[PDB]
Each structure stands twice: as C-alpha cells, then as structure tokens.
Amino acid sequence: MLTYGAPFNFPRWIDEHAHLLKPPVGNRQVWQDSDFIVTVVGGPNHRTDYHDDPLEEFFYQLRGNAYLNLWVDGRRERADLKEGDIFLLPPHVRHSHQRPEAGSACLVIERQRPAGMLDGFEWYCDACGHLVHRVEVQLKSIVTDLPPLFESFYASEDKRRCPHCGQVHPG
Numbered sequence: 001m002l003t004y005g006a007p008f009n010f011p012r013w014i015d016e017h018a019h020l021l022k023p024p025v026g027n028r029q030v031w032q033d034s035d036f037i038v039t040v041v042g043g044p045n046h047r048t049d050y051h052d053d054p055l056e057e058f059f060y061q062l063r064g065n066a067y068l069n070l071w072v073d074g075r076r077e078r079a080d081l082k083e084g085d086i087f088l089l090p091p092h093v094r095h096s097h098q099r100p101e102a103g104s105a106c107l108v109i110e111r112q113r114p115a116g117m118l119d120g121f122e123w124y125c126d127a128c129g130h131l132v133h134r135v136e137v138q139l140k141s142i143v144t145d146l147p148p149l150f151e152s153f154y155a156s157e158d159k160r161r162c163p164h165c166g167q168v169h170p171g
C-alpha cells in the first residue's frame, strides 16, 4: 500500500524534469492523486495575476532566486525567495509568483481543495490599487478551465478597465 512509490533522489528527479521547468509549462507535479500537492516551479516565468488560495502554501527555494508579489494590508509588497529560503503563506493572501531566472527550482506544497472550496485569480490596478477582475475555479479543473478565463480577460479591455479610475490593465 505504498500508493506513491518508494523514496527517490529529488535533485536527480529535478534534473530529469528540468525541461518541463522552462517556458511554456514551467512546473511539474511530483505525485498524482495525493492529498499533498507537491510541485516544482521553474523559470523564467512571469505573471500579472494574483492567486487567492483558500489553503496554505509552503515554499522551499531549492535552486536560484525568485520572489512573490503580495497584496498585504491593502498594499503591494515583495517577498524574496532567495535560494535556500522557506516560507509559509497563510490562506487567502493574494500572491503573484515571479521567477526571473532560468534554471531556478522551487518546491511548492499545497493541499487538495475539498469540493466547493474554490481558488481565485485576481488582477489589481497599478494606479489606485483597486481590484479589477476576479475569476474562480476548482483546482482539479485548472489545466482545462483557467486559460480561457485568462485569455478572455487578456483579449479585451472592458474587463481590464479599473472600476475606480479607467486605467486599462496590461495584457
């Protein structure tokens, strides 16, 4: 009943999957159908959306440097993930995970969401900090439900107009 297999060497697994840590996919899950969602995140990859995870996220930056853009107490903040850093993110802290370096690798551990507990993705306005857009989605469906929601927000400027000012968010 060792459902997830035997122990194996992690640096070698990361070496073997380094081509998946590059653009365009930029990440690779370790075990399937587990309660703990164990992912290695690579680079270069940049994103303007903020994740609203209903549960905690654990980070261990194994290779290279990266950083999280955070929405903390109404303001934008930057949390560095230098090589060797660990970090535990409380639920619902909006975060945008930036990875400027090729060859970087970050261990990210999350929990499977119970059904009905949805993930949020949001965009904020650079000028007034107001929320511009939010989409919601069940984690188990993201590979095949999120890009069209992103694309729809990205392919058109009405959704990008901040309701408090009018600045069209980028694309």
Ligand SMILES: [Fe+2]
Residues within 6 Å of the ligand: 051, 053, 057, 095
């Ligand atoms: Fe996240």
Ligand SMILES: [Fe+2]
Residues within 6 Å of the ligand: 125, 126, 127, 128, 129, 130, 162, 163, 164, 165, 166, 167
């Ligand atoms: Fe604004």
